[PDB]
């Protein structure tokens, strides 16, 4: 349903975690090195793995 980080479902750019399958606003994940939504949204774009699933 809602953002695994902020727990709202407001409008924005969303990524699905490839580990747990939950969704997150890309803008709520502030980890260094993540890059831009663009690199995820395209075909064969990077895989998103949420902060908890990463390690």
């Amino acid at each position: 349903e809602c953002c695994l980080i902020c727990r709202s479902s407001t409008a924005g750019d969303w990524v699905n975690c490839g580990s747990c399958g939950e969704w997150a606003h890309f803008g709520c994940d502030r980890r260094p090195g993540l890059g831009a939504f663009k690199d995820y949204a395209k075909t064969d774009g990077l895989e998103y793995v949420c902060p908890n699933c990463s390690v």
């Binding site: 969303w14 699905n16 490839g18 774009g45």
Partner: peptide
């Protein structure tokens, strides 16, 4: 990744 853009 699987993504979406929403507006609600």
């Amino acid at each position: 990744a699987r993504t979406k853009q929403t507006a609600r």
